[PDB]
Design a protein around this ligand. Structure first.
Ligand SMILES: Nc1ncnc2c1ncn2[C@@H]1O[C@H](COP(=O)(O)OP(=O)(O)OP(=O)(O)O)[C@@H](O)[C@H]1O
Ligand SMILES: Nc1ncnc2c1ncn2[C@@H]1O[C@H](COP(=O)(O)OP(=O)(O)OP(=O)(O)O)[C@@H](O)[C@H]1O
Ligand SMILES: Nc1ncnc2c1ncn2[C@@H]1O[C@H](COP(=O)(O)OP(=O)(O)OP(=O)(O)O)[C@@H](O)[C@H]1O
Ligand SMILES: [Mg+2]
Ligand SMILES: [Mg+2]
Ligand SMILES: [Mg+2]
Lengths: 97, 13, 257, 257, 13, 257
C-alpha cells in the first residue's frame, strides 16, 4: 500500500474480461456466415464484411456468443456479437463441443 | 391502413 | 360467402403507415431535393421494399396531354445477374416505352433520352446486389451525367458488393438503416395490425402481455414475420370457426418458425 | 405363371396412408390457402417425397375445354445444379408446354405467363437443395410477384443451403418436420404392410415380438427401410417356395442392413 | 384403403 | 420562390479554383508541349474528373471560318467495356463529326483523319480502366503514330489493368497523383466553400474548431464528400427556414457517412 507510485485505476471488469478472452482468425464467408469449431454464427452486420478475415474473441466456457472485431486503418474495431444460430438460449462449453 | 397493395397497382396503371 | 371472402381478403396484402416508412420518405425527399445518391440497407423483411413502393405511389407520374409522362421517381427491382441491357430494359419499360431490339449502346442512348424529358429525379434500385459489377458503371453514369438521385436498396449483402468497387462505395456512402422494432414501437404496431389489418369480428387482444410475449418471441421484431404470422393464424381461426385469434392457434403458428 | 406375377407386383411401389402423410396434407392445404411459402424438412427415407406425390395427386390438373389446364399444385424435382433455365423448363413442362430455344429472360417471361393462366397456387420443389444459389432469387420472385406458396423439400442439407442466404432463410422459415416412426405407430405401420402391401397367401405375423423386435433394430423407424426390407423378404420367401415370410428369411434380410 | 402408386398415376391423367 | 431558387443553385455543381486543379493544369500543359503520354491516378472523388473537365474548357475548340475546329484537347469518358469502335465513335463525335455505319477499319481511318486536321494535341481518357484490353492497342497506336499525348485517368483499378500488358504499362509510366486534402489545405478549402459555393445569407464559420472536427472526420479530406455534405446541409438549413448551416444540421448529415 505504501509502495505504489499512484493508486491504480479501477479497471472496468468487462474490459478485463474482453482482453482475457482468447481469440482466433476467420473470414466472414458467403451470406455472412463464419465457421468456428463446426458451429456457425452470425450477427447484425456480418454479411457486409463477407470475403475478408476478421478477429473474433471467444470464451471456452460459453462459445455461443462470439465477439467479432474488424481491423481497419490497421486498428481493431468491434463489429457485433455473433450468436450461434439456434443456440442463443443456453451456454455450450468448448470441451464437449 | 394505407392501401390495398393490388388496388394501388390498378390505380397506378 | 363470408369465409371465402375473408380468407381471400386476408391472404392479401396491405400497407400500414409505420414510423419507419415516414422516416424513409422524409429522408428520400431530402435526397431527391439534393439529387444525392445514397443507399437503404437493412435486414430481410424489415419492410424496405414496402416502404420504397409506398414512396413511388406518393410520387405518382403526372400526366400531361400528348407528352410522355413526367415520372419523378422510378422504382426497379432487377432480376438476378442484371446486365446493362437488362437494367436499361427495366428503366425504359417503367417509363412506358417499349424496347426495340438493338445494341447495348442503343439501349443506353434510348434510356438516357427518356430519363430526360420524363423528368426523372430519383432512381430506386431495389435489391441492387443483383446488379452485375459491370452494371454499376452505367448506374454511376446515370447518377453523374443526369441530375438523378440513385438509391440502392438491399440487405448487408449489398454492402459486400459495394465495398468491392471504390467508385460505387464512395458515391453511395450516405445511407439510411432499417432496423428491428422493439419496445413501445412493436407494441403499437401489433395493436395497429389487429385494428386495421385483421379486421376480425371479435377483438383478438394481441396487445395483452401474454399474447405479446408470443409475438415478440416468434417475430424477433421483424415486421414481415409479424404480418405473416397474424394472417396465417387468422385464416386458421376463421377456417376452424374461431371469430378471433386465440392463444392456442397463435401458439401453434409461432411454433412453426 | 404364378411366381412372376406376384414378384412383378412386389418389386413395385405402393402408397399407404400414414398419419405422417395426413398431417403434411392438412398442413400444405393451410399453406396453399394462405399462399404461404414454407419448407418441409426431415431425415432421408422418412417418406417426404411419397407424401408430396400423394398431395399432388389429390390436387389434379383440371381440364377446361380448349383452355390450358388449371393446375393448383405444381411438383418438380430439380436435377442437380439446377440453374434458372432448368427450373423454368421444369415448371413450364410440368404444365403441358414445350420450351422454345431462348434466353433466360424468355424462359422467365414464359414461365411467369404460364404460372398465371394455369392458375398455379402451390409449387413444391422436392430436393430444393439441388437449386443453385442464384436460382433461389427466381424462386423468391415467383413467391413474391405471384401469390404462390413455394414449398421447399429436403433434408438438413436444405437448411445448410438456406441459411447461407438470409433473404431465402427469412422467407422459408415456417417448416414441418418429418419424424422417425416409433412405438404403437411403428407397430400399427408394420401391421398394415403385410395386409395392405404384401398380401402373400398366408399370414406372416410381422407384428409378433420376435419379428417386430428385429424389424425395429433393422429399420430404426425409417419408413423406407421398413418397406424395402419387407418387400425383399416376401420376394425371397416366395422364390424359395414358401407361402409367407419366415423369420429365417427376415433374419436373412435384416442382417444385410 | 391403400393408394396404389400406379392407380394414382393413371387417375392423374 | 427564393427557397426553391436557392435549392436549385445548391443542388447544382460548380468548379472551384483549388490548388490541386492548378497543379494538374500546369502538369498537363507540360505534357501537351512535349506530346508525352501519362496517367493521372488517385482515389475516388479526389476531384480528378472535375480537374480534367476544367482543363478542356480552358483549351476549348478554336474556330476558323469554314474549317473544321482546331481542338487541342479531346476529353472522353468511355462507356463500360469500351471496344475500339466505341472509342473511335467517342473521339470522332467529340470533334463534331458524325460516325457513319462501317467496319472497325472505317471507324479507325476516319478517327485518324479527324485527329489530324483538328490538330489534336492531347487525348484525355477518363475511367480508362473501362477500355477492353483489345482497345488499348488502338490507344497506343494513336499515341505512337500521331503526335498526341494520351492521358489515362483512373483509380488504382487502372494501375491494375495497366499492369497486365507491359506495352501499356511502359508507355504510361509517367503519372501524377491526386490525393486527400489535410491540414491548412483542408482548412482553407472549407472556408473557400463557405465563401464561394454556399453563399448563405449568414456566415456559418465552417472553419471553426467544432465544425472542422466533424468535417475532418466525415470527409477524410475527400473533396467530393465535403462538397456533397455542405450542399445537403445548406439545403436542410434553408428548408428549415434557417439562414445559416447550424452545427446540429451538419452533425445530422455527417452521421450518415
Ligand atoms: N409497412 C408495412 N405494412 C404492412 N405490411 C408490411 C409493411 N412492411 C412490411 N410488411 C410485410 O412484411 C413483408 C416483408 O416486407 P418487405 O418485402 O418490404 O421486406 P424487405 O425489407 O424488402 O425484405 P428483403 O430484404 O428480404 O427483400 C411484406 O411483404 C409484408 O407482408
Ligand atoms: N406412405 C408410404 N407408403 C408406402 N411406402 C412408403 C411410404 N412412404 C415411404 N415409403 C417407402 O419409402 C421409400 C422412401 O420414401 P421417400 O422417397 O418418400 O422418402 P424421402 O423422405 O423423400 O427421402 P429422401 O430424403 O432420401 O429423398 C419409398 O420409395 C417407399 O419404398
Ligand atoms: N474543383 C472542384 N470544385 C468543386 N467541387 C469539386 C471539385 N472537384 C471535385 N468536386 C466535387 O467532388 C465530386 C467528385 O469529383 P470528381 O468527379 O472530379 O471525382 P473523381 O476523382 O473523378 O472520382 P472517381 O474516380 O470516383 O470517378 C464532384 O462531383 C464535386 O461535387
Ligand atoms: Mg424486399
Ligand atoms: Mg425424397
Ligand atoms: Mg471520374
Amino acid at each position: 500500500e505504501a509502495g505504489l507510485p499512484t493508486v491504480p485505476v479501477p479497471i472496468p471488469e468487462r474490459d478485463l474480461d474482453i482482453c482475457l478472452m482468447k481469440q482466433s482468425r476467420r473470414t466472414v464467408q458467403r451470406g455472412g456466415c463464419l465457421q468456428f469449431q463446426n458451429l456457425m454464427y452470425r450477427g447484425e452486420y456480418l454479411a457486409g464484411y463477407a470475403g475478408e478475415t476478421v478477429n473474433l474473441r471467444f470464451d471456452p466456457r460459453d462459445i455461443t456468443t462470439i465477439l467479432v472485431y474488424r481491423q481497419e486503418n490497421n486498428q481493431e474495431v468491434f463489429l457485433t456479437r455473433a450468436h450461434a444460430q439456434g443456440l442463443e438460449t443456453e451456454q455450450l462449453a468448448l470441451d464437449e463441443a | 391502413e394505407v392501401w390495398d397493395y393490388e388496388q394501388l397497382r390498378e390505380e397506378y396503371g | 360467402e363470408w369465409l371465402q371472402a375473408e380468407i381471400a381478403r386476408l391472404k392479401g396484402k396491405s400497407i400500414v403507415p409505420l414510423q419507419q416508412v415516414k422516416t424513409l420518405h422524409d429522408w428520400l425527399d431530402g435526397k431527391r431535393k439534393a439529387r444525392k445518391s445514397c443507399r437503404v440497407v437493412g435486414e430481410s423483411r424489415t419492410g424496405k421494399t414496402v416502404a420504397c413502393d409506398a414512396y413511388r405511389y406518393r410520387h405518382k407520374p403526372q400526366q400531361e396531354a400528348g407528352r410522355p409522362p413526367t415520372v419523378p421517381v422510378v422504382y426497379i427491382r432487377p432480376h438476378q445477374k442484371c446486365g446493362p441491357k437488362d437494367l436499361f430494359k427495366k428503366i425504359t419499360e417503367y417509363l412506358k416505352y417499349r424496347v426495340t431490339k438493338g445494341t447495348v449502346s442503343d439501349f443506353r442512348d434510348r434510356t438516357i433520352e427518356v430519363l430526360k424529358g420524363c423528368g426523372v429525379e430519383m432512381l430506386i434500385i431495389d435489391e441492387a446486389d443483383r446488379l452485375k459489377p459491370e452494371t454499376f458503371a452505367d448506374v454511376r453514369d446515370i447518377a453523374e451525367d443526369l441530375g438523378i438521385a440513385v438509391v440502392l436498396v438491399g440487405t448487408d449483402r449489398l454492402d459486400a458488393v459495394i465495398k468491392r468497387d471504390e467508385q460505387v462505395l464512395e458515391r453511395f456512402r450516405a445511407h439510411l438503416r432499417f432496423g428491428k422494432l422493439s419496445g413501445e414501437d412493436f407494441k403499437n404496431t401489433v395493436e395497429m395490425w389487429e385494428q386495421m389489418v385483421l379486421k376480425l369480428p371479435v377483438s383478438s387482444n394481441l396487445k395483452s402481455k401474454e399474447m405479446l410475449r408470443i409475438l415478440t418471441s416468434a417475430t424477433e421484431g421483424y415486421i414481415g414475420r409479424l404480418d405473416e404470422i397474424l394472417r396465417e393464424a387468422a385464416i386458421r381461426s376463421l377456417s376452424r370457426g374461431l371469430k378471433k385469434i386465440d392463444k392456442a392457434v397463435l401458439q401453434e403458428v409461432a411454433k412453426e418458425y
